[PDB]
Copies of this chain bind each other. A is one copy, B any other.
Amino acid sequence: ELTLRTIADEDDYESYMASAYSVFLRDPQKDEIEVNRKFTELDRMIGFHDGKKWVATTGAFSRHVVLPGGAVVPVAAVTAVTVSPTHRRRGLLTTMMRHQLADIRSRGESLAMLFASYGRFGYGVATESAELSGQVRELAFRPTVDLGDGTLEEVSAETFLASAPAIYDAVIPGLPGQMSRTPEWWASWTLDSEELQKESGKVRFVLHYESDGTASGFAIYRPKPGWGNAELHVQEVLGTNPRSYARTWRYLLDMDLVRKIKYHGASVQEELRYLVANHPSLECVVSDAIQVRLVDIPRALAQRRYAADVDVVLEVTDDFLPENSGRYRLRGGLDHASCEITTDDADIALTVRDLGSVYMGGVSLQVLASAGLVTELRAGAVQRAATAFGWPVAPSAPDDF
């Protein structure tokens, strides 16, 4: 009765997306569906169709993510994973996962990434995000923070998109977890969506210029006028130097009529948290961001760099895809990494899910071992491997997908 297949045409695409919104209790957002189509590859959007409607969906975008060390590697940005409530408990999700994970491997993508909404398929939470909020009048900076001689203006979307991509491209190599943005992805990220207009207001754009005129920072925010307490909902703030970063935030914090500010999806180590003189005034709520599924374990482990030297043997168990199970020797450091099968004694035993959780440096392997989820087989091995899998810059959430 059910057929697993890819999207065939534009009408089929809109019906596919409508079903995915419908499972999540929402009407289809036509503006987001239209803009996201520009970077959608129909042959990566699979699902089950019963002859009259889509009953399950699973798709992926071809993206590139910054790894610890600065390498930018292809990644399957998994999206639109739904099973209709009428078609649950029929194995449809397992079938789509097996098909998609094989398809991802064939495209040379060493890992998949998914926004938390899956551990039994090998996905593990690898990065977190922080919701930062507080009263703007309480958010003065420490007295040593240099705001610089820069200036800034509120600009149109077209003016914003002529300067923001170069700023973004310049800063992301040092921010693992961030993803490359083509003009098509910028169009989705900057869309004045009707859904977000209901929650706050129309999207606004800010550019920070140095004294010589060069653009060195930007901000994307939406105002929420007082409905009683006006709020500013920040979508993104980035700068190419600490002065443009601090000055841009100072602009948002000193805006008249504003009482509260909210930044959802910030880094757990967002620089703003340390610029604020009184930390309690900026509430920080930490939650899951990205889940990682390692698809090619040796290549993924050899593609990132490590915070310190490591020479560890990992006994990796992959329950969902047993072909990936094996004993790998990881030799890595700041400027080198290799991973290959070995018959030497294993130092650590862990599942591919937990290996994925530590892969981006956002989850400590030592805490997983203390929790009993990872087993140390030889003394001192977990401690050194945990530091190596870490990174001085915490991973952060990419733009939504």
Contacts and interface: CB of A to CB of B under 8 A. Distances in A.
A5 interface: no
B274 A243 contact: no
A370 to B, nearest CB: 6
Contacts of A9: none
Please give the count of copies of this chain that the complex contains.
5
Interface in A291-345: 307-309, 334
Contact of A367 (B154, B271, B280, B351): B271
**Chain A contact patch, size range:** 35 or more
Nearest to A120: B143
A287 interface: yes
B25 A85 contact: no
B393 A390 contact: no
Interface stretch (A30-38, A71-79, A95-103, A144-152): A144-152
Interface string A227-263: 0001000000000011101100001001111100000
A6 interface: no
Interface in A165-215: 174, 201-202, 206
Interface string A1-33: 000000000000000000000111111000000
A214 to B, nearest CB: 17
Contacts of A94: none
Interface in A368-401: 368, 370-373, 382-384, 386-388, 390, 392-394
8 contacts: A25-B225, A86-B154, A125-B279, A144-B351, A144-B373, A274-B371, A284-B286, A387-B392
